Design an enzyme around this catalytic site. Structure first.
Site, mmCIF file in Angstrom:
data_model
loop_
_atom_site.group_PDB
_atom_site.id
_atom_site.type_symbol
_atom_site.label_atom_id
_atom_site.label_comp_id
_atom_site.label_asym_id
_atom_site.label_seq_id
_atom_site.Cartn_x
_atom_site.Cartn_y
_atom_site.Cartn_z
ATOM 1 N N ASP A 59 -6.438 8.291 -0.506
ATOM 2 C CA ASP A 59 -5.985 7.270 0.431
ATOM 3 C C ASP A 59 -4.760 7.808 1.211
ATOM 4 O O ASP A 59 -3.897 8.469 0.617
ATOM 5 C CB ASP A 59 -5.525 6.048 -0.321
ATOM 6 C CG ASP A 59 -6.639 5.375 -1.077
ATOM 7 O OD1 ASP A 59 -7.786 5.440 -0.691
ATOM 8 O OD2 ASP A 59 -6.339 4.768 -2.086
ATOM 9 N N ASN A 92 -7.717 9.086 -5.784
ATOM 10 C CA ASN A 92 -8.497 8.104 -6.544
ATOM 11 C C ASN A 92 -9.324 8.807 -7.600
ATOM 12 O O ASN A 92 -9.587 10.007 -7.502
ATOM 13 C CB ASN A 92 -9.403 7.316 -5.592
ATOM 14 C CG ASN A 92 -8.611 6.540 -4.548
ATOM 15 O OD1 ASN A 92 -7.729 5.795 -4.894
ATOM 16 N ND2 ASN A 92 -8.917 6.724 -3.290
ATOM 17 N N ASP A 113 -15.548 -4.806 9.126
ATOM 18 C CA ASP A 113 -16.711 -4.212 8.429
ATOM 19 C C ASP A 113 -17.517 -5.234 7.578
ATOM 20 O O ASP A 113 -18.592 -4.916 7.086
ATOM 21 C CB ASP A 113 -16.245 -3.048 7.535
ATOM 22 C CG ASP A 113 -17.402 -2.169 7.035
ATOM 23 O OD1 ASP A 113 -18.232 -1.771 7.860
ATOM 24 O OD2 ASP A 113 -17.458 -1.883 5.821
ATOM 25 N N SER A 172 -11.709 10.743 -3.968
ATOM 26 C CA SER A 172 -11.335 10.469 -2.604
ATOM 27 C C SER A 172 -9.826 10.329 -2.608
ATOM 28 O O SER A 172 -9.225 10.289 -3.644
ATOM 29 C CB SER A 172 -12.013 9.215 -2.107
ATOM 30 O OG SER A 172 -11.618 8.122 -2.848
ATOM 31 N N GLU A 191 0.824 -1.205 0.000
ATOM 32 C CA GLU A 191 0.000 0.000 0.000
ATOM 33 C C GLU A 191 0.862 1.261 0.000
ATOM 34 O O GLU A 191 0.556 2.205 -0.706
ATOM 35 C CB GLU A 191 -0.927 -0.026 1.192
ATOM 36 C CG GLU A 191 -2.041 -1.071 1.101
ATOM 37 C CD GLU A 191 -3.111 -0.767 0.045
ATOM 38 O OE1 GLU A 191 -3.032 0.293 -0.619
ATOM 39 O OE2 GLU A 191 -3.953 -1.675 -0.199
ATOM 40 N N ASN A 225 -9.050 5.278 3.032
ATOM 41 C CA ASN A 225 -9.722 6.121 2.073
ATOM 42 C C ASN A 225 -10.668 7.147 2.695
ATOM 43 O O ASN A 225 -11.348 6.835 3.650
ATOM 44 C CB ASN A 225 -10.468 5.221 1.109
ATOM 45 C CG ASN A 225 -11.096 5.978 -0.034
ATOM 46 O OD1 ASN A 225 -12.251 6.423 0.028
ATOM 47 N ND2 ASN A 225 -10.371 6.094 -1.086
ATOM 48 N N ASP A 247 -12.435 8.693 -8.145
ATOM 49 C CA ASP A 247 -13.704 9.277 -7.593
ATOM 50 C C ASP A 247 -13.543 10.580 -6.806
ATOM 51 O O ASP A 247 -14.526 11.134 -6.281
ATOM 52 C CB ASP A 247 -14.461 8.242 -6.739
ATOM 53 C CG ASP A 247 -13.834 7.966 -5.393
ATOM 54 O OD1 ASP A 247 -12.682 8.348 -5.142
ATOM 55 O OD2 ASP A 247 -14.514 7.353 -4.565
#
Ligand code: NA
Length: 129
Positions: A52, A46, A101, A50, A35, A59, A48
């Site tokens: 990270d 990203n 989650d 967003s 990562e 995110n 979209d």
């Protein structure tokens, strides 16, 4: 801060990640390597909109607030910048929420694609833990 492999393993162990929800330490170290290359200051934007953040590339669409991700949530209740600290506590505490989650570590695309189903114990071999 750029961690060494064993240094990070020790830090994660101390913060309760070894076998957290059944993921052995090597899993967490492997995910961090791919990562962020073990760099707490890593950021990546990203498609979209967003971003990270940090060693585990958490995110802003769901987990932290960066003030620039419209319609997003802040499920860890932290500014995304807290995730960039040399102190990994906030990243670890948020990662524990993420991995709980529903989808386990599959939440981390690099884990799924580069760590899952590999000999992850290799990531902690040789370390004093
Ligand atoms: Na957010």
């Amino acid at each position: 801060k750029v961690f060494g492999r064993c240094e990070l393993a020790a830090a994660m162990k101390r913060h309760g990640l070894d076998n957290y929800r059944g993921y052995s330490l090597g899993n967490w170290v492997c995910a961090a390597k791919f990562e962020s290359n073990f760099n707490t200051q890593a950021t990546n934007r990203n498609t979209d909109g967003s971003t990270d953040y940090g060693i585990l590339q958490i995110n802003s669409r769901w987990w932290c607030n960066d003030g620039r991700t419209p319609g997003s949530r802040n499920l860890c209740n932290i500014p995304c910048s807290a995730l960039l600290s040399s102190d990994i506590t906030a990243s670890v505490n948020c990662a524990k929420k993420i991995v709980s989650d529903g989808n386990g570590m599959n939440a981390w695309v690099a884990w799924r694609n580069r760590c899952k189903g590999t000999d992850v114990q290799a990531w902690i071999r040789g370390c004093r833990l």
